[PDB]
Structure 1
Amino acid sequence: IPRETIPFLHLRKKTPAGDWKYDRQLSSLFLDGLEKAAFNGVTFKDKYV
C-alpha cells in the first residue's frame, strides 16, 4: 500500500466530527484476511446466517 494512496477495498473509521474517513491500518488487515482468504480460504463453520 503506497502512501497518500487508497486501495480499492477500504474500510472506514469515524472522527469526533461526524464523518468517516479512510484509515490505513484498520483497512489494511481487512485485506490480509482476503489474501489469506484466497491462498487458503476462509471457513464459516458453526455460523448461523
Structure 2
Amino acid sequence: MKVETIPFLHLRKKDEFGNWEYSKKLTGIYLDGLEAAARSGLTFQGKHALMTGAGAGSIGAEVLQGLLS
C-alpha cells in the first residue's frame, strides 16, 4: 500500500500469466514515433515489402501508397 485514461492506441505486454496488459512504456515508444511521423514524416528507403489484399480503396491500398512515398 489521480484519474487516468487509455490511449485509444496502445501496445501491450504479456503477464507471467500470458495476459496482454496495457504497457505505457511501449504505448509511449510507439505513439512517440507515431507523432514523429505526423511531423517530419517517415521513410521506408531501401525496404522491400510484400502486400496482399491491397485492393482498390482498402486499408492495404493506403498502406501501399505509404511505403511508396
| CA RMSD between the two structures | 1.2
- Per the alignment, residue 39 of structure 2 pairs with 39
Larger radius of gyration: 2
Q: What TM-score, normalized to structure 1?
A: 0.84
Runs of 4+ in 1 over 6 A off after TM superposition: none
Q: How many residues align?
A: 47
Unaligned segments of structure 2, at least 5 residues: 50-69
> Comparing both structures, which one devotes a greater share of its residues to helix?
2
Unaligned runs of 5+ in 1: none
1:1-49 equivalences under 5 Å are 4-49=4-49
1:2-49 Cα distance to aligned partner (Å, 9 max, x none): x63211110110011011100001111101101100110100011110
Provide the TM-score with structure 2 as the length reference.
0.62
> Which structure is higher in RCO with an 8 Å CA cutoff and minimum separation 6?
1
Q: Supply the distance in 2 between the matched residues of 1:13 and 1:4 (Cα, whole angstroms).
A: 19
